[PDB]
Design a protein around this ligand. Structure first.
Ligand SMILES: CC(=O)N[C@H]1[C@@H](O)[C@H](O)[C@@H](CO)O[C@@H]1O
Ligand SMILES: CC(=O)N[C@H]1[C@@H](O)[C@H](O)[C@@H](CO)O[C@@H]1O
Ligand SMILES: [Ca+2]
Ligand SMILES: [Ca+2]
Ligand SMILES: [Cl-]
Ligand SMILES: [Cl-]
Ligand SMILES: [Zn+2]
Ligand SMILES: [Zn+2]
Lengths: 309, 309
């Protein structure tokens, strides 16, 4: 069969399992909601992976291993999810390697989803060949990944690159991590949904000519079509993300910042604006781009298998 | 003569030149104000260094080289100050190596003052032997230095570890760098002086039993003696610094954060508090300490000579 990985991505909303080729083509992708409880979650992960493994044979793909992208702090050497924010409940001190390798008879790699995104950008994307770069992946939450001297920074306790929890206010909105003023609390999908559902609750989102559960994409559309509450909300959100980027520049001084997720296209202009208004002159040459990868986290999970098997 | 370095530290207020032994003893230190213009500054640096070099002979110290700690973005490989905030005016595109080595007939090393502080903590202080750690040096401004895999991070454009310009507000106080909401703008010496001079302007600083130009140390004393405007100001300042630390933890995840400068003792408790209230569980084991070094920047400048000559 063709040389492939099984990739899993456990997100703040959806659980996705894919067969991914050596070249970074998604051969087939399965999607379910990410269950809210451990027992259900682990069982569905195994179920999905067994099915995908069986389909891979039918599609003439040879699976070399399983890579797992997950929210949370992860010890990749051991394949253990250490601690999760409430975006994934019941996801603490979880050994993923043992049940998956026992069931599938494959080697298993695990890392944080932002770290995986970085790995995808390094193998398939705009980070290829760069000694240094940072990625922020916007989704349900905001993930980060930091590449320095060509390699990930995991930190002294596997908590480096938790860039969604860069703080840019003394107060702000509460974050699901339990803090307040985190860029995730301003600019994530979950943040913008919550703010779109607010407006729509007080009949203040819909305008001009939208049809119509409110979400991020509706807030963006209201603003494009002149909704001033929605424009204000999005500016504040983008400013906060831009300031998180400023903190990254002044900390790591990467050559490149890659924004990914569907919201990346919507924030890149304001992020660039905030850098130009506020950051030091010596970081103004930083390249800030939108990712050209469909699904960094899933591709990154596959990349662990493809590079290390 | 005993094995020594000449060390220079160009700060936001004072220019200091010292003879420093191999063991990190300051043999003799000269202090002048840092002139506000280039021509005066360069001439005084040379003057001071020639005098110190002459005294070193009399004190039976053998000078191996000159190390320079300066505010600003620095290319250490070339010995060039690239760009400075207005804390040091007329300090852009300055080749320091050439005039100092031509005049003194010594090799010359130059780095940012926060980077030097890190180097001192790695050689003489609590960073010795640590694969990773970060330092924040509070003075006129706030400096940073990042040690990762035992070595400094300088960044893609020599602007890494500009940690005084971590931003913790959407608005916020103006910073001298031209931004607003930087931790320097909240918590530096210059920030606290400015806030002490405010209060004292409206006869609202002095209390209880202080005698008496207002400065940081007077604001701290007013608060210790029950001044509630001053306590509020200091809490906000400490919170902002603590949040800058939170951003560092969630970015780099160092094992150790070293706070230095005279204000370090005053902020460490609140910094620890903010970490415990707001940072992720996986960074709670971070050690946060006050430096045991008298003068990290000056010792760090000496360390470049002592380690690399
Ligand atoms: C479950 C969990 O802790 N998720 C974190 C973080 O680890 C993720 O990278 C991020 C994006 O999914 O969401 C959240 O910020
Ligand atoms: C002149 C200059 O740009 N100084 C900066 C920074 O580079 C310094 O490290 C810091 C502390 O002195 O002050 C300021 O934040
Ligand atoms: Ca991460
Ligand atoms: Ca620095
Ligand atoms: Cl919950
Ligand atoms: Cl000025
Ligand atoms: Zn948070
Ligand atoms: Zn600033």
């Amino acid at each position: 069969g063709t040389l492939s990985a099984l990739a899993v991505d456990l997100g703040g909303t959806n659980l996705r399992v894919a067969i991914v080729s050596m070249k970074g083509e998604i051969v087939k992708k399965y999607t379910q909601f990410n269950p809210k409880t451990y027992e259900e979650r682990i069982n569905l992960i195994l179920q999905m992976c067994v099915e995908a493994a069986a389909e891979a044979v039918k599609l003439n793909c040879r699976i070399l291993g399983v890579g797992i992208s997950t929210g949370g702090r992860v010890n990749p050497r051991e394949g253990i999810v250490l601690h999760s924010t409430k975006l994934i409940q019941e996801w603490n001190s979880v050994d993923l390697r043992t049940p998956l390798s026992d069931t599938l008879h494959l080697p298993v790699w695990v890392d944080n989803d932002g770290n995986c995104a970085a790995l995808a950008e390094r193998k398939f994307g705009q980070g290829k060949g760069l000694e240094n770069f940072v990625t922020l992946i916007t989704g349900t939450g905001i993930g980060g990944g930091i590449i320095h001297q060509h390699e990930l920074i995991h930190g002294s306790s596997f908590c480096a690159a938790e860039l969604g929890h860069l703080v840019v206010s003394l107060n702000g909105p509460d974050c699901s991590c339990g803090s307040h003023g985190c860029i995730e609390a301003y600019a994530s999908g979950m943040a913008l949904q919550r703010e779109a559902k607010k407006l729509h609750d007080e009949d203040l989102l819909l305008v001009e000519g939208m049809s119509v559960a409110v979400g991020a994409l509706h807030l963006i559309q209201a603003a494009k079509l002149g909704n001033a509450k929605a424009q204000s909300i999005l500016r504040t959100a983008g400013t906060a993300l831009g300031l998180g980027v400023v903190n990254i520049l002044h900390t790591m001084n990467p050559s490149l910042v890659i924004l990914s997720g569907v919201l990346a296209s919507h924030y890149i202009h304001i992020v660039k604006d905030v850098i130009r208004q506020q950051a030091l002159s010596s970081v103004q040459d930083v390249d800030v781009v939108v990712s050209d990868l469909v699904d960094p986290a899933l591709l990154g999970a596959a990349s662990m298998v493809l590079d290390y098997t």
